[PDB]
């Protein structure tokens, strides 16, 4: 069952109302329960706007208490690709900063319904290349990562496979990735109400990013249909048992271990989606960071 | 785990080599795993010919023992949209027939590749219609339903939601049907391989009967995204334990009980795709065929 | 998820309050909700005792309509070795005696806790050994087979491990039996509130039924440990979805399959224990108990 | 499935032959296979003897080469009570020690057959008090937890249970335990073959160490059937996919969080049990010793 402290939680009115309040209103729920989490220190941050093909993207930039080299973590936020932003994440990605002993950039890629799909993934990749071929300014040679969370890991998953044979990523890092359309799956019918993303929620998301149903069949949205999965970078990728979105990102982590891919795939029991981002009043999200920052560690500097 | 007498026919050879010899070998094999059955006795036997929108169709009729009135069931064969016909199905029809005591009328459908994509829903459609405007040559007032197992039992599906508001089917038996497109599953990814039906052959079979990638968003091909389920007929869903097209029908189950639809879902434990076809050599499938035939006896006549 | 239906009828208060009323007071809530079901017209009916060698054992005798010669079931009620009774079960018996066109006797064996473990057994089997012998007195000469539910179920299991080598049991039907000591399983964890079976339920049948924890121990609660399941008669088990003893029972058809005995397990999905006693508010129970019918009329008359 | 490199390895030979050959040489096989990793270096290491109530007890102490104040992690290895010793378990000790900074000192309770239970649990205890007893000897402030693989995971499990206001132990660290008699869960029966760990080595070992059947129930060999779990220390469980332990260990993880128990309970996906010993050869080992230094640097140092 669920964690009863999570249970008690949920019980207790914890929920965003996707789809039943305003645009503006949603967003404004979800940075309060967000940015509510403690602000870590850091060394030093900086943000920062990358000249992307679109769009001036902005993105801040946190740096380790740990002397350099660094390797760089990008990160992209979740919310559906509608909610949240960097500032909101700010607790996260210090958090994760700290845990990995390296630079940690996140990206405020475009959100729909103001842009629509792919402008989030076309920020994304941008800002992965800029990041990529400017490391030098975040004393950053040990290399670049990609890491994101829900809509964050889907466009992380992506940016993977736009990056292949382009630059050199060491690590992808996919926390409940949304991988792409689901009609299907135990998981998603199982666990579409009742556990803080739901069913409607997710398909509330869909219907302002998405321009229509022929996106649903774009690699850049659902990249488990990829061609081609080989030789992307190793990955971990975690999920959580009470998540209609559990079962695809099983699958996603078993197609990447058949194309030849080194995976990491673990779930976490009792928890549900979106648990880092309350790492305060969901203890299990403080295990889950640990566990980016070994992985992160070992990739970039051969350290435990 | 599989029933161990599955597991020794599995280990012992028994195979369609669907993709890997041409499309007339895979047929005749076929033809001889399903053929080889005993035929029951029935009452009486036709072939008739039913005048289809695009084409003669095709249809065996079996009458059973028992004496009239009857329901009408009306039969379609599995086999990927690409193998089976209506006489290797004969052992199977004369059993459901003799289960059932009502009259079988199985459909010879349009086959891929020579046809592709929506040609065997437009001609499974048009029988249907054609039956239920001609059960008086039947003796068949008691009325119609729809059966079908595997891509028959998709096209079964999709027939009922063609039927809403023009033919009033009585129900709806769906034996491990292919409820559409599906890259996330559990079953499909636990499933892939060594089951009988593997991913490669699903991928083969759609490759043959789908004409692009659009197909798949068709309601015609993946009636679980139909934008209204409700007031279909009364559904019997079959399904097998060990089989990559598990969870979707029982997605599907679920999402038809949601639209207030009459469903009894049932999983036969131990068993692989297909499995009716083999009822001589897996003893689950003649229970399965009598749990079709209580079903059946009960809608047309109130009878146990 | 649940049947909608159903999770409508627990949430409108459909309860058995065991463990908080009296034993008096559970066992009349029981023999209310059970027995409100509409009794179908049988052939006759009778009440006989059957000599035992503890004590004298009630039981109702029910013929079909159908012409003899007959196979004859041994029926044993569920209630948790605590609650119900023949007479609570007299719609469930008329409505499968109806579907397997067979004569039924279903037999009140000594319950907990005025009688405690092994009472339940001892009686169960002495009234299938008195049943064998007297076959003749039903013109009963196409056999026997045995059959119960839930605690029912548990002992039917058990009088076909302690028949081997003394009677000829056709068949056993086992409709989601209690198969022993369960304090590990998926099932148990996560369906042990909330699906009208709750563990608390199921500890406080335990604790009235047996008499030590070695009792736990012993193959005839715990049958599922018996050292040897071979030679016993081929079994029907059925299973519900959302049912905390579903993943013991699906053990036990596989430990039987192990063993080389016939079975067809079937998991009756989006229904919970006890659901064929509600078959009138629950409509698969209608098709488990067709599906019953289906198997013994196979077993006893080799009919459809 | 299982990730591809594991499926080769077991494909490959990877095997220790429990029950078909000398207790004398499984001992040896198991040695081969765990004491091949690689040693890493850690600061210091040093035998010591523990003054056990029936034994003197052997234990090997690691010390990281970080500076103190340390924790002190008492680790119980695995081999299902008969296989395995301090010697073949120093490679993932000497992991661990790296990856939490900590003191860990390896205990060497007595094996069956030559030691029935209790023995094993008996000096799994007196050493955990003779630690927390002594831990200035460590310059061990930062106070006391206990971790062990397998069989060791049961023993870990048993001292905290036994440990309760005695002793005050920070967390609990079980790595794929054995939780307890398990005659049902879905995953005993499901991997009971072809996984690494089988049924027969299960039983096998459980006949060389059990007395009687009675010990089953004794919460010192099952203690998912203590009484009371309230009040013991917080716990990190992994848990693997293909494993027949794992429905047994995610249960425990719930009970105990049910008793208000702190609880990470994480499945490692595509997995056998095992796999921490493998870690070499298995990716996702090196991630779950990263996981336990997380898990240990917090709750002893309060470090990320």
């Known amino acids: 069952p669920l964690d009863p402290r999570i249970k008690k939680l949920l019980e207790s009115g914890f ?4 789809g039943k309040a305003s645009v503006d209103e949603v967003r404004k729920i979800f940075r309060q329960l967000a940015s509510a989490a403690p602000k870590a220190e850091v060394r030093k941050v900086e943000d920062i706007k990358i000249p992307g093909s679109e769009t001036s993207i902005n993105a801040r930039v946190y740096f380790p208490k740990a002397k350099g080299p660094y390797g760089v973590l990008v990160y992209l936020h979740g919310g559906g690709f509608v909610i949240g932003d960097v500032e909101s994440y700010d607790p996260l990605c210090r958090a994760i900063t700290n845990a990995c002993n390296c630079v940690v950039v996140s990206v405020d890629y475009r959100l729909a319904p103001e842009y629509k799909f792919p402008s989030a993934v076309i920020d994304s990749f941008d800002a992965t290349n800029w990041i990529y071929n400017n490391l030098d300014k ?16 889907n466009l992380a998953a992506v940016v993977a496979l736009l990056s292949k044979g382009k630059l050199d990523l060491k690590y992808q890092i996919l926390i409940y990735p949304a991988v792409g359309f689901d009609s299907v799956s135990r998981s998603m019918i199982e666990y579409s109400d009742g556990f803080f993303l739901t069913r409607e929620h997710i398909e509330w998301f869909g219907s302002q990013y998405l321009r229509s149903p022929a996106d649903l069949l774009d690699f850049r949205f659902s990249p488990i249909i990829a061609q081609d999965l080989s030789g992307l970078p190793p990955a971990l990728i975690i999920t959580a048992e009470y998540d209609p979105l559990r079962d695809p990102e099983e699958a996603y982590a078993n197609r990447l271990l058949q194309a030849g891919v080194p995976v990491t795939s673990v779930r976490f029991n009792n928890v549900i989606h979106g648990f880092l981002s309350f790492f305060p009043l969901i203890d299990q999200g403080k295990d889950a960071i640990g566990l980016i920052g070994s992985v992160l560690r070992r990739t970039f500097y051969d350290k435990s």
Chains 1, 2, 3, 4 share one sequence.
Do not use: K, L, N
Not at 138 to 153: H, N, Q, T, Y
């Open 15 to 18: 929920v965003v109302p996707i």
């Open 138 to 153: 975040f004393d950053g040679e040990m290399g670049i990562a990609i890491a994101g969370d829900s809509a964050g890991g």
